[PDB]
C-alpha cells in the first residue's frame, strides 16, 4: 500500500474543531487542548516570541 | 546512537507493561492479631493468569472471600487453618518457628507480616533446616541458605502446578499466547542482527559481536549487554 | 540591661551547642513530617523576626518552608553542546535556597506579600526558613506607620522581582562601591553580567 493517495482514504477522524475560547479550528477533540490558544492546557493564552522576528 | 531495547523497557509503556487489569489477586497472607481461631473451607480452584499455577478460593469463619496460593493436593471442601497453633497439615499457614525441621514449605516471608515473597512459582519449595531462638535457616529453591526470622509466616507443602517446565512449547504460537499474559515484549531479535545505531553488537558484514560479550558491572545502561559481570562462561573447564 | 530577645539571639549564634542542640534534634523530627509550607502561629526566632519587621498584629503571617539541599537538579543536554556547556553535576543555581523558600511561601499565600525571611536550620538533606508575610488589604496594616509601605501597588509580587532583602543581597547589591559595577541598578540593565 502506498503512503500517498491510497492512505488518504482512511482519513475520516475528527480531531481539530472550533474552539470555545478563541474561535479557531484548533481544538483537538481527543486531547481536549487547543493548538492555537492553549485552551485546555493553560489559563494563560498561548503566545510565543518566535511567532515574530526577533527584533519585532 | 539510539536507546537500546532495555532502555525503552524502563519507561513503562503499554508494550512493556503487564496486563494488570486482567489479573485476579495479589496473593498475600491473612492478617491475624494472635491466637489461632481462623479457619476456612476451599470453595473453588481457579487459574491465575499471572503465574500459570493454580489458585485456591477460600471462605473464612468471619465471612472473608479471598484467593490464596494453592499447594499440592488441596481440593474443594478441604479445611485450612491460619494462625500460630495451626495444624501441621499441607496447605496451612503458620510461622517458621512452629513448623518442624525437614518439612517442604512455600510462600515464605522476608520480613514478618509482608504476605510471602519466596517460593511462589509452579512446583517449587523452600526447605526448613535449622532452628534457634534468633534464626530459622531456610533453603530456597535456588539452593541458597537464607537465614530468616522465626516469626516469618509460610504455607506448608510444595506449590501446585509442578512439572510445567518439563513439556516443550513446540510452536511459536504457544509462546505468543503465554507472553501476551505476562509483562514481556516478545519476540526477541538478537543484537547481533541489528544495526550499529541500535545495539552495541549491531553492524558488520557478518553477524558477530563487536567486542567481547562479558561486560563490567560498572557499565552504563546502554552498554550493559551480553554477559553481565560473568564469573565465567562456557560449559567446559 | 540585656533584653530577653538578646538571649534567643545569642542561642542561635551556635545552633549546635547547648539547649538549642537538643531542641533542634527534637523539633526537626516533627518538621520532617510536616509539609513544604507550614503556617505557624509564633516565630521560632522572635528577636530575628522583630528585627526583620515582624509585629504581633493582625495580618502578619509567618510560615516555615523546607527546600532541598545542594546544587541544581538539572537535566543533561539532549542536543549538541560544546564541552563547556556539557555540565550536569557541578552546576549550581543563581538563586540561593532562602529565595526559593520565600517564593514557595508567597505562592501558597497569593494575597500576602513577603516582608522577610530567616534560617531556622538544616539536616543532611533539606534546609528550613521561616518567612514573614504581610496582608496589604487588612486595615490593621493599612494604618500601621511602620508596615503600610507594603500596601502600594508597586509592591505587588515583590519577591518574584527580587525586591526582598534576600533578593537584593543575592543580586549583588550589598556594596555601594567597588565590585558593584554590573549589579546596580539592576542585573538586566547591565546585560546580565552580575
Amino acid at each position: 500500500t502506498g503512503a500517498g493517495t491510497p492512505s488518504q482514504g482512511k482519513k475520516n477522524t475528527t480531531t481539530h474543531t472550533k474552539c470555545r475560547r478563541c474561535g479557531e479550528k484548533s481544538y483537538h477533540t481527543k486531547k481536549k487542548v487547543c493548538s492555537s490558544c492553549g485552551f485546555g492546557k493553560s489559563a494563560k493564552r498561548r503566545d510565543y516570541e518566535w511567532q515574530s522576528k526577533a527584533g519585532e | 546512537g539510539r536507546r537500546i531495547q532495555g532502555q525503552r523497557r524502563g519507561r513503562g509503556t503499554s508494550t512493556f507493561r503487564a496486563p494488570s487489569h486482567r489479573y485476579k489477586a495479589d496473593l498475600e497472607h491473612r492478617k491475624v492479631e494472635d491466637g489461632d481461631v481462623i479457619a476456612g473451607t476451599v470453595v473453588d480452584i481457579e487459574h491465575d493468569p499471572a503465574r500459570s499455577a493454580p489458585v485456591a478460593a477460600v471462605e473464612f469463619e468471619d465471612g472473608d472471600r479471598r484467593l490464596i496460593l494453592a499447594p499440592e493436593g488441596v481440593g474443594v471442601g478441604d479445611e485450612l487453618q491460619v494462625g500460630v497453633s495451626a495444624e501441621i497439615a499441607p496447605g496451612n499457614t503458620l510461622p517458621l518457628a512452629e513448623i518442624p525441621e525437614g518439612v517442604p514449605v512455600c510462600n515464605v516471608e522476608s520480613s514478618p507480616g509482608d504476605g510471602g515473597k519466596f517460593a511462589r512459582a509452579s512446583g517449587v519449595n523452600a526447605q526448613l533446616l535449622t532452628h534457634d531462638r534468633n534464626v530459622a535457616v531456610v533453603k530456597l529453591p535456588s539452593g541458597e541458605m537464607k537465614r530468616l526470622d522465626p516469626q516469618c509466616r509460610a504455607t506448608i507443602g510444595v506449590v501446585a502446578g509442578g512439572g510445567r517446565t518439563d513439556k516443550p512449547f513446540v510452536k511459536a504460537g504457544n509462546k505468543h499466547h503465554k507472553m501476551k499474559a505476562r509483562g514481556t515484549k516478545w519476540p526477541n531479535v538478537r543484537g547481533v542482527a541489528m544495526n550499529a545505531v541500535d545495539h552495541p553488537f549491531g553492524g558488520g558484514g557478518r553477524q558477530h559481536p563487536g567486542k567481547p560479550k562479558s561486560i563490567s558491572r560498572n557499565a552504563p545502561p546502554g552498554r550493559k549487554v551480553g554477559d553481565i559481570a560473568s564469573k565465567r562462561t562456557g560449559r567446559g573447564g | 540591661a540585656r533584653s530577653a530577645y538578646s538571649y534567643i539571639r545569642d542561642a542561635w549564634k551556635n545552633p549546635g551547642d547547648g539547649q538549642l542542640a537538643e531542641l533542634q534534634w527534637q523539633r526537626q523530627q516533627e518538621w520532617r513530617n510536616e509539609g513544604a509550607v507550614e503556617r505557624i502561629e509564633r516565630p521560632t526566632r522572635l528577636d530575628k523576626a522583630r528585627s526583620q519587621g515582624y509585629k504581633a498584629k493582625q495580618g502578619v503571617i509567618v510560615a516555615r518552608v523546607s527546600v532541598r539541599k545542594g546544587s541544581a537538579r538539572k537535566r543533561r543536554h539532549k542536543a549538541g553542546r560544546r564541552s563547556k556547556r556539557q555540565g550536569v553535576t557541578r552546576i549550581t543555581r543563581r538563586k540561593d535556597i532562602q529565595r526559593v523558600a520565600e517564593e514557595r511561601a508567597s505562592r501558597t499565600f497569593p494575597n500576602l506579600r513577603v516582608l522577610n525571611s530567616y534560617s531556622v536550620g538544616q539536616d543532611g538533606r533539606q534546609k528550613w526558613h521561616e518567612v514573614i508575610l504581610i496582608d496589604p488589604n487588612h486595615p490593621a496594616i493599612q494604618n500601621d506607620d511602620d508596615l503600610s509601605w507594603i500596601c502600594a501597588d508597586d509592591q505587588a509580587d515583590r519577591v518574584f522581582r527580587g525586591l526582598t532583602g534576600a533578593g537584593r543581597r543575592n543580586r549583588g547589591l550589598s556594596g555601594k562601591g567597588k565590585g558593584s559595577e554590573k549589579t546596580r541598578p539592576s542585573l538586566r540593565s547591565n546585560g546580565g553580567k552580575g
Binding site: - | - | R82, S83, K84, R85, Q86, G87, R90, I91
Partner: protein, 92 residues
C-alpha cells in the same frame, strides 16, 4: 664529549681572567605560587580548559649544554650559549 671541570677563562663580573668550575644546571623546584599557577586554578572549569588541557611535548634527538660557570675567586656564576652534545662527561 669530554669537558674539563676547572679551567681558566673570562669572568664578566670580575672583569679579568680567573679559574672557573663547570657544573650542570640542576632544576630548581617550583613554588606553585607564580601567576601561571593561579591562572590554571582560575581558568579551569567544566569541559576543556584550553591551554591547560594540553600535555607536554616531545624531545629533540640531542639537547644543548645547560651549564653554569662558577668563578674561583668571587664565587659568582655566569651563563653561556650551549652547544649540541649527546653526552657531556667531566674531567676530574
Amino acid at each position: 664529549m669530554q669537558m674539563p671541570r676547572r679551567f681558566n677563562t673570562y669572568c664578566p663580573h670580575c672583569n679579568e681572567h680567573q679559574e672557573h668550575e663547570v657544573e650542570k644546571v640542576r632544576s630548581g623546584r617550583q613554588t606553585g605560587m607564580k601567576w601561571i599557577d593561579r591562572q590554571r586554578e582560575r581558568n579551569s572549569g567544566i569541559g576543556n580548559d584550553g591551554k591547560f588541557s594540553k600535555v607536554p611535548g616531545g624531545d629533540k634527538p640531542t639537547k644543548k649544554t645547560d651549564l653554569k660557570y662558577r668563578c674561583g675567586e668571587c664565587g659568582k656564576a655566569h651563563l653561556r650559549e650551549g652547544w649540541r652534545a649527546g653526552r657531556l662527561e667531566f674531567q676530574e
